[PDB]
Design a binder for this molecule. Sequence first.
Ligand SMILES: [Cl-]
Ligand SMILES: [Cl-]
Ligand SMILES: [Cl-]
Ligand SMILES: [Mn+2]
Ligand SMILES: [Mn+2]
Lengths: 400, 389
Amino acid sequence: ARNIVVEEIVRTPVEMQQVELVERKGIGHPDSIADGIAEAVSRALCREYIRRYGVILHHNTDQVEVVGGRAYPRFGGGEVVKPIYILLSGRAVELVDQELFPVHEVAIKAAKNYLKNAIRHLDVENHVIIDSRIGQGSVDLVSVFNKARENPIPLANDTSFGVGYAPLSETERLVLETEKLLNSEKFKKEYPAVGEDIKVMGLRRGNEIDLTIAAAIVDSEVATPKEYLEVKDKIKEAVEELAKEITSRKVNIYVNTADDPERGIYYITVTGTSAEAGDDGSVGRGNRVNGLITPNRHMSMEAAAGKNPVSHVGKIYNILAMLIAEDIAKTLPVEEVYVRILSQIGKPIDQPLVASIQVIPKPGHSVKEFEKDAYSIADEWLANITKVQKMILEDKISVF
Amino acid sequence: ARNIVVEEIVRTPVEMQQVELVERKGIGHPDSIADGIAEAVSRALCREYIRRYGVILHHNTDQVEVVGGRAYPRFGGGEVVKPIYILLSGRAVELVDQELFPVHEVAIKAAKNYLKNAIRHLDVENHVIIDSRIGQGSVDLIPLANDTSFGVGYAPLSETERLVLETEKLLNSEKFKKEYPAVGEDIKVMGLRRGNEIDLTIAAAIVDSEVATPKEYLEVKDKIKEAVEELAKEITSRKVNIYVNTADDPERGIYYITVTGTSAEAGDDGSVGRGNRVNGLITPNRHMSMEAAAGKNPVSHVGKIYNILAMLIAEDIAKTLPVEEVYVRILSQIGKPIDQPLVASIQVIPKPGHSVKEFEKDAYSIADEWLANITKVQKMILEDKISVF
Ligand SMILES: [Cl-]
Ligand SMILES: [Cl-]
Ligand SMILES: [Cl-]
Ligand SMILES: [Mn+2]
Ligand SMILES: [Mn+2]
């Protein structure tokens, strides 16, 4: 019934390709800040719609602009001189049966709460201005409930595709886990000088990987250039240990490569994010839903962060494509699998115009031998598509 | 000696894959409006820096937020009820040796001029609010790489890529607009190929002042369909199915009519880097860069230059040599001039019956000459001769 297509492709697996480039924008990167606020706003709206009406009402808050401020970092502690300005945009239902729903209150509080929990040394009350221009919508709940009855699985409202793949390469895992380690609670507690604005790039040529880390250091935690350099060495040491667990390839680690001590240049910040110094961010400019930027792979340009987890395929299909890919890679004799899913307007989101599965089989196997099981994995996930709504709101799946 | 590497790759060509997906967001789509404004602002800043100082000063205007308005379309002509709001962001040099450069004036003027020329039925003075929060820079009056920057491009386009690209270009061309003024600029095209059959879905905003009745609206949709059917026959002999404004439901009174020709009027939002790559397409069957070219300084941003150069190198190779596919990737080497990349990888599938040895030397030479003329590409960008979305 469902438009699922399984095909074999021939390609050099990424692990065997000569040049592989992978990047991850960490939590404090301005683009990832935009994504994180967008998603925090969406989840807060979902939960408050549920609390008041028992159902999620339509909204999309996948539009956030982070306008950088100005700052004077100094060893021992600088100051922010001009605040970061953040504009929340999108659309949400505001009039519910002639009654007013507190869209802007929920959104601004969610954005502020996200920043406080994400960027430890950022003074949100004084370093940030948050304004909201979220568009106004209206609905009658009887209609909402009737729409839910007519179509238990929501209808697609856009023509969009999501893209995912599996399994991850060593270089992909290295980049992902380097950022996760350095922004982990345990590491932050041990090394409070390491801010959250961390960008990780892995470039593999053959069996040698250059792993470059741009990590904003918090100037209130380093009194001297010497203490700053000791922090960079502690970053390098921790990532060296991590790399030995992920790959037996040679890994060269570089931290804050624009540093130039003789010219007095160090990557120190007041708050731990370069957004303080004038760098800007917006939604969908960084990691895909698997958490990575991967030009050796395939992606959708849809920004998952902030999109309605109930009906917007731009989020749902990018998550589902990754989950189907991971399932196939985990259970079948596959070297690589790429999943692309395209919505059809007016049809339920479990009836995509196509769900395309492209597989490189392991040597000694053919896709024909397992094509029906691959179909079945995609079919069961599409038939259970609404559970993605549940995993988002239970904070079980990240979208950047 | 530039580190250019030409190698053969063995992989299923896109045209032989069973399923291919291609999308293009047309000029009036909110995301493409953001991209277009971003690039229009950058080029206006470049020209005015040159006019005043003889050099381009540092800037990045790759941050634009299009916040949709409200509108009540009506057959015969509706009205915009709440204006579109556009925030310009990024950074530009504003203090030039203690004197003030009119960043915000240049930027707002450039944004308004772009909209005026791009969206025919948009009343910019009354339908749009443009504000600027571009960050303030300062300065006192072949570049080296400061980072590892990346560009990726490919050629030639597949039949489905060509159909999607040329469908939007046709419907938003002046010649077509003159004959069918009811067709707005907010056109989104999705192409799905399965085997030798292509499904083409077109969402095209129709201008409500140009259609007096539902009957005229349906006639306009049929003229879109007929025109694209003709175009498809020029590109492919695969079966092509064309669908226009598929969410329409006449019995329930739903038609894709707009006052201005862009869904930004009705509350849809856009921002930079959410849509087309520099070749004009969104192509999940290919390899794409995540960087937003629009608004980036074309003189100093290596990622923008390399993504354009990679496309130009690929297109040249595909046009002149016996290649079925070519993928071009360029990586800068930190601390070296940008015309001396860390690697320029040229990956080719030869046409059947051919081997790369026949033409590997010519492919190297094509890549070499483009890298040697990186300054020529920068000029082409400012002369509006190369599109970036
Ligand atoms: Cl290959
Ligand atoms: Cl098929
Ligand atoms: Cl990229
Ligand atoms: Mn960015
Ligand atoms: Mn969009």
